[model samples]
Target: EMEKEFEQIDKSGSWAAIYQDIRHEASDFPCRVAKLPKNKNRNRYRDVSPFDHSRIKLHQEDNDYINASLIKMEEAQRSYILTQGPLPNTCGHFWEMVWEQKSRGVVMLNRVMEKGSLKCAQYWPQKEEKEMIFEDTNLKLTLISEDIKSYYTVRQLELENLTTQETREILHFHYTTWPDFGVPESPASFLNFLFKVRESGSLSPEHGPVVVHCSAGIGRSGTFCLADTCLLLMDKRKDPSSVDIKKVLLEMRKFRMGLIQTADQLRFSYLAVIEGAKFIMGDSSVQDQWKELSHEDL
Candidate 1:
C-alpha cells in the first residue's frame, strides 16, 4: 500500500517538481505564534518558522519561547524533537528542553562553523574544558567523552538538573561534513552514519525523543528522521517494499514544516533510505561497503 503510493506520486514529475508541490501545500498551513516577544532575538536565522501543533512549548516561567518542535510518529513508536541549532541567547532554553523531556541523545547535523559562516551556536562544552554551566536554566553540561571519527564526532555528555541536582547521560552525535542545503557525497556514507546512531539505542521508544537539529532544523534534520522512519517501518514489516517514503514524509511535515528542504535533499533521502533498507533486507555487507567508501581519517 505504502510503496504503491510512493510509486504513483513519484511517476508524475521530477523530484523537484514533486517536492515543490509538497512544500507549497505545507506552506499554506499557518505557522504558530510568529511574533512571540521572547523569540524576537533568539532565532539565528529569520527565514525559518516552526509549526504550532508540534512546536515545543517551554515552561511558562522560562519566557516560553524556543524554535523547536516535538516530532512524534505514534504508530512507528519513534519521536524526535526537531529544532533549530541553539542561538547564544537561547542555549539555556535548549538544555531545559533536553532535561525536561529526558532526551537520551542529540543528533547535531551541522558544524558550528560552516564555510566561514556560523551555522549554529557552540552549545556544548569544549573537550579541553571539563564542563560548562548555564545559569539561566540552572543546568550544568559536562563533556564526558569525545570520540573524533573522520566524518562525525561522538560525545558522551552529562546533563545535570541543577535545581534537583539530578543528572543523566546524553549522547551527542555530530555529523561534521554534510553541506547546508545539500546532501552527503553518497548514500553509503550517510547510511553508515545513520547505523551508528541506531546502534546507540537512543532512538528507542524507551527514551524521550532524541533531539535532532541542524541550522534551521528542517533540511538535514528532516532527512534524518525521514530515513530513520522509513527504515524502522521496513524492519517492523519485514518487507522493504511495504514502506512508502513519500507518504511518511507528508505525515512528518504535519509535525514540523519544510522537512527535506531541497529537491536534492529529497532525492538524497530516497537514496539513503533505499540503500539503508538493503541492510535490513539481508545485505550484510552493506555496512562494510559504506565504511570503506566513506573514509575515517580526520
Candidate 2:
C-alpha cells in the first residue's frame, strides 16, 4: 500500500499539498524553555526552537536549556537526538549533550558554510588542528582519524571529560554534498552514506541516541531520520508496502516541531525510502548500483 501510494502521489504531483497537510495537522506546541531570557542567546535560530515537552535537558547546570530534542522511534527501536548546528558559544553545550547522553556517534548533515553563509560553527577539531578543548564543559575532542570520501567523510573522534578523566570514541559522519534546506542529488548517494553510519553500529540500540543535526536541526536532519526509520521498519515488518511515509513523519513531528522543513524534503524522504526498500526486499544488485551511482571514489 505504501509503495502504491508513493507511486500515485509522485505521478499525481501532489506532494506539496500532502506536505502542507502534515504541517496543518502538526501541533503548535510551546517552546518555553528555549524562550527564557537566559536561554534566548542559546538558540541558533529564533523560530526553530525545540518544543518544551520533548526538548533535551542538561543536568547539574545553571541553565539546562539546549536547542535539542530526543526523538524516539520505538517501533523501529531507534532514537536520535535531533539538534541544531552548534553556535560559536554553544559548541561547549553541544559537546556536553553528546557526553551526557553517551552518544557514540554524531551525524552532521550540513556544511560549516552553505551558500556563502555561516551555517554551523567549527564544532570539531579540523585536520590542521588535532584537538579542541572546551573549558566551560571540561570536554576535549581529539581527532583520531579521518577517512574522506567523495561526498562524505567519516572521522573517529575521542571525547574526553577532563574532570572525570574519562574518554569515549565517537564516530563522526559528515555528508558534505547535502545542501542546506535541500536534499542530496539522489537517494542512492544518501543511502550509501546512511549505510556507512549503520555499518559502524552507531545507530544500533546498544549505543546512546545518535546525535543528528543540520543548520536548524529539522530539514535535512528530519529527512535523514525519516528515511532511516522507514527502511528499518520495512526490514522488521518484512513488507515495504506496510510502512506509511506520511504517518511516520507525523509521529516524528510530535517529538520535534517542524521536522521536515519543506515539501521537497518530504518528497525526498519518500524517494529515499522507496529506493532503500528495494535493497531491503532482497535486491542484492541495488547495493552495487548504489556504490556506482554515488561515485564514492570520486
Candidate 3:
C-alpha cells in the first residue's frame, strides 16, 4: 500500500496538494514554551519553535528551554532528539541535552556556513583545536579521530563531564554535500549515508536518542528520521508496502512543529523511503549499487 500510494501520487503529480493536506492536518499544536520572553533568545529561528508538549527541557539552574524536541517512533523502537543548529550562547545547552539525554551521536545535516549565511555554530572541536570546552555545562569535547569520505565525514569524539571527570564516546556524522533548503542529489546517496549511521549501532534502542540537527531542525532532520523509521518498520513487517510515509510524518509532526519544511522535502522523503525499502526487503545487491553511486567506496 505504501508503494502503491507513492506510485499514485507520483503518477498524478499531486505532491503539492498532498503536502498541503498534510500541513493542514498538522495543526492544533502549541509552542507556548518557546515563545516565552526568557526562552525567545534560545531559539535559532523565531517562527520555528518546538511544541511545548514535546520540547526538550535542559537541566540548568534557572533556564531549561532549548529549541529541541523529542520525537519518539515507538513502533520502530527509535527516538530522535531534533533541534536547531546551536547558537553561540546555546552551544552549551546543545551538548547539555546530549549529556542529559545520554545521546550517543550527533547527525548534522547542514554545514556551519551555507550560501553566505551561518547555518550552524561550529559546535565541535576542529582538528587544530582538538578540544572545546562548554563552560556553562562543564562539558569537554575532544576530537579523537576523523574519517573523511566523498560526501560525509565521520568523527569519533570523546565527551567528558569536567565536573565528574566522566567521559563517553560520541560519533559525529556530518553530511557535507546537502545544500541549505534543498534535498540531497539522490536517495541512493542519502541512503548510503543513512546506512553508514545505522552500521555504527548509534541509533539502537539500547542507547539514548541520536541528536539530529539541520538549520531549523525540522526540514532535513525530519526527512532523515522519517526515512529511517519507515525503513525500519518495513524491515519489521517484512513488507515494504505496509508502512505509510505520510502517516508516519504526521505522527512525527506531533512532537515537533513543521517537521518537513517544503513539499520538495516531502517528495524527497517518499523517494528515499522507497529506495531504502529495497534494501530492507532483502535486496543486498542494491546496497552495492548505492555505495557505488554515492562514491562511498572511494
Candidate 4:
C-alpha cells in the first residue's frame, strides 16, 4: 500500500465524497488550479476575452543563454546543466544554428530546409544534420512560457545533446500559445505528452532517472512526468483508489513554486489521473492510494 501510487476519487476531495461517487468534483477542480501573472489587477481574475495584448506585451523578457547539452547525463549524474555555467555545444553545428545556450535549456529543431542549401531530413527531415538535431541533447527547454503554452506541435521534438564545436538548431514542437482546456482536456494533453516521451525513448525506465523539462521545468514537464508515474502504478493495480488532492499536489508545489499554475491545468490532472487509471486497470476495484496509505503528508 505504501508503494502504491494512484488513488480513486469518484468525487474530487473529502474522504466521504470520494466513496460516494460524487461528480461534484468538477466545481472544486476549477479552484484547485488558479494563478495570475505578475503586476495586474488582482480583482480575483481579469477576464479579457479579446485578451489585452498590450498588458502581456510588456511581460516578455530575453535570456542570456546558459543552457548545456550532454549526449548522456550518465557520465555526470549529479551535474545539472541548468544551474551550472555553459556546457559543450559539441553538436550545435550539426543542428543548423550558428549557436545557442541559456538557463531555460530547450533542444529545439528546425523543421524545413532551404532549397540548394544543406538541411536535415529524417523522421521529419532528410539530412544527417537534421537527424542530429532531433537525436539527442542534455536539456529540453521550451522557448515559450506556460502562460502561452497552447497548441503544441505533435510532429517535432528535440533532444538536448550537441557538441560545443557548433550551434545546434534542433526542431521541436512549440505549444503555439498557452494551453486552454477544462479539467479533462488538460489532463489528456498531459497524458499524451507522456506517450510522446515514451515513443521518443525519453522515459527510459531502463536508464534510471528519466529527465523531463519544460521552459520552467515544472509546467508541462513536471505535470507530464507526474501523471505518467501515477498511470504506470495504476496499471499494476486492480482496485479503485484515491489520491490526497492536497498532499500530492503540495509535494509538487514544494519542488516547483506553482506546480499547477492554472485552475484548468490543475483540474486536468484529475481527469488525466482518471483516464490514466482507466487506461492502466480499467474501472476495476482499484484502491485509492491516497486514502489507503497513512503516511505523513509532504
Candidate 5:
C-alpha cells in the first residue's frame, strides 16, 4: 500500500527528477507506449519550432520520403543533452536524436555532441541569432515538469558498515563507454574518457538525485547502464532481487525516451545484456551484439 503512494507522478510536478539517476519512486504503468524526447535548438535549424508537435503532421503529408528504416516512428521528441565543457576546452551544448515507435516507445538512441564538443549540437548561432536560442540549464526543470510524470523515494543503503557517510549520503554515479570504431583513433578513449569524466563533478553519483547528460544520453553510455542493471537483476531472477524487465525499460524511456537510438544500436544492447548474463552464467555466445555495436562506434 505504501508503494502506491509514490508513483511516477510524484508530489513534485517536476517530472524530470523521476529518473534523475538516484532511483525511481513511482509506477502506475498499465500500458505499452513509445517514448521519445523532442529535438533541442530546433528554432535555429528549423524555421518552425521542433517542440511544436505539429512537425509530425508535416512528415505524414510529405510524398518524397524514401529509405527502408528498421522501425516505423509513431510520435517522438528530440532533445539536446549537454555536459559542462572542460576548462581548457571551448565546448558547447550537444544534440542527440531520440526516436520511438508509438507501439515500441523510444527505439533510436544517439548522442548529439562531436569530439565531446558542441559540433553535434547544431543551430549554434554566432551573433545575430544568439538571443533566439534556448538556454539548456534553465529549461531543464521547466521542460521536465511540462512533459513528464515523475516521483521520488528515499531508500536506505545496505552497505552501512563499509561505505563512508559522505559517500552513502550521495547518489551513485555510474559511468559508461562504447567502443566507437567510428572514432577508431579514440573509439571513446579509455584513459582519457575516464580522466575527463572523473574530473567533471557530474560523475559524482554519491549525492541524492543524479542526472546524466551526454549530449542525448541515449547511445553507448545509456545502453551500458541499462544492460548492467538488467544483468544484475537477471542474476537473482529466482529471488526477491529479480525485477520486471518491462518496468525497467519504462524507467529508461521516462528519462529520455527513444534512448536506444538506432535499430542496430538497439539490437546491440542485446549483446551487452547477454554478455552481462554470460559473465554471471559462465557461458558466452560468439554471435554477440556488442561486437557489432563496437564496429559502428557511431
Candidate 6:
C-alpha cells in the first residue's frame, strides 16, 4: 500500500503545487504567533511563518523573535526544536536560543552555501581556533574541534555566557548532501546521518531537545524529525504497525507550520520509515539494502 502511495505521488507531477495547496488548507494556524519581529529586515525572507506554540520566548527582549519552533513527540518521548537557518543579523538570537533552551546540539541539515547561494549564516566560529562574539546577546561562540566526513561535518562548539564567564559545549552536526528545499538523494545516506546524530547522545532526553534546522526549517528539518521519531516509535513499540507516520507528521505540524513541505518529501519520509523498520525488525541484511540504495549509481 505504501509502495502504491509512493508511486501515485511520483506520478502526480504536482507534489510541489499540492504541497502548497495543503499548506493553504492549514493556513488557518494563528499568524499572530509573535508580534512580527520588529527587526523584520533581519529575516532571510518574509514569507516564512513563525509558530506561536512552543516558540522560544526571549526574555524582556524588544525584538528578534526568530522563525523557530519547538516540536515534541509525546508518545515517542522525543523532542526537537525545528528552526530556520540563522539570518546574518539574527545569528545572535540563534545562539541565544541554544543557550536559553539549554540545547546540547544543533543539527544543521543545510550548508552555509548551496549552489552558490547563501542559505544560512556561518553562525558559529568557522575557524578551529577563533571565536565569534555576538555582542547583542553577550554570548561567545568558539569552535573547539571539527571532524569532517565525506558528506557531513561534526563540530564541537563552546558557547559561553560571557556575563557569567561560564561555558558549555554544543555539538553541531551539519549534513551536506541534502539540498535546499529538496529531499536527499537517498534514504540510506539520510539514515546514516540520522544515526550519527543519535550516537552523539544529544538527542537523548537527558539533555534538552537538540535543535534541528535547515534553510526554512520545515522541509529537510521536518523530514529528519519525522524519520527519527517514526523509527524510534517502531523500536520502542517493537512493531511498525504501532506507529502512524502521517498522524505523527500532522501532530508535529500543529506545533510548527508547513512541516514535511512536499508530497515528494512525504513520500521519501515513508520510504525512510519503512526502510528503517526493516532494520529494527531484525534484518541484519538491511544494512546491505541501505548500502545499495545509497550507492551513487542508484
Between candidates 1 and 3, which one is better according to TM-score? 3
Q: Which stretches of candidate 1 lie over 4 Å from their true place?
A: 1-13
- Over the stretch 1-298, how does candidate 1's per-residue lDDT look in tens digits? 4445445657875677888878877633455464565568877667777776667877757477788888788767799999999989888889999888878989999999888999898999887376888998899999988999988989999999889989999999999999999898888889888888888988877888899999999999999999999888888887887777778888888887789989988878877887787788888898999988888657
Q: Which stretches of candidate 4 lie over 4 Å from their true place?
A: 1-190, 208-210, 282-298
Candidate 3 least-lDDT 10 residues: 122-131
**Quick one: ranking by lDDT, best first?**
2, 3, 1, 6, 4, 5
Which scores better on lDDT, 4 or 6? 6
> Which digits, one per residue and each the tens of the lDDT, describe model 2 over residues 1-298?
6668877888999889999999999878889889998998899888899999989888745889899999989899899999999999999999999999989999999999999999999999986376999998899999999899999999999999999999999999999999887889999999989988999999988889999999999999999999999999999988987898888999999999889888999888988998888899999799889889999895
What TM-score does each of the candidates earn? Answer: 0.92, 0.97, 0.97, 0.40, 0.32, 0.88
Winner of 2 and 6 under TM-score: 2
Candidate 6, which segments miss by more than 4 Å at Cα? 1-27, 33-37, 284-298
Candidate 5 per-residue lDDT, tens place, 8-37, comes to 334553234433422343223311111222
- For candidate 5, the TM-score is 0.32
**CA lDDT, every prediction?**
0.84, 0.91, 0.90, 0.33, 0.28, 0.81
State model 5's lDDT: 0.28
**Candidate whose lDDT is highest:** 2
- Model 1, C-alpha of 206: deviation from truth (Å): 1.1
For every candidate structure, what is the RMSD over all alpha carbons to the true structure, in angstroms? 2.4, 1.2, 1.2, 14.9, 18.6, 3.1
- Please give the lDDT score for candidate 1: 0.84
For model 4 the local lDDT of residue 170 reads 32
Model 3 stretches with alpha carbons more than 4 Å out = none
Give per-residue CA lDDT, model 4, range 219-252, as digits (tens): 3443453455555545445443644443454533
Lowest-sum lDDT 10-residue window in model 5: 140-149
What TM-score does structure 3 among the candidates reach? 0.97
Clashes of each: 0, 0, 0, 65, 29, 0
lDDT of 3 by residue, 1-298 (tens): 6667877888999989999999999956789889899887798998899888888998887889999999988888899999999998999999999999999989999999999999889999887366899998999998999999989999999999999999999999999988877899999999999999999988988899999999999999999999999998999989886788899999999899888888889999989988887888888999889999998644
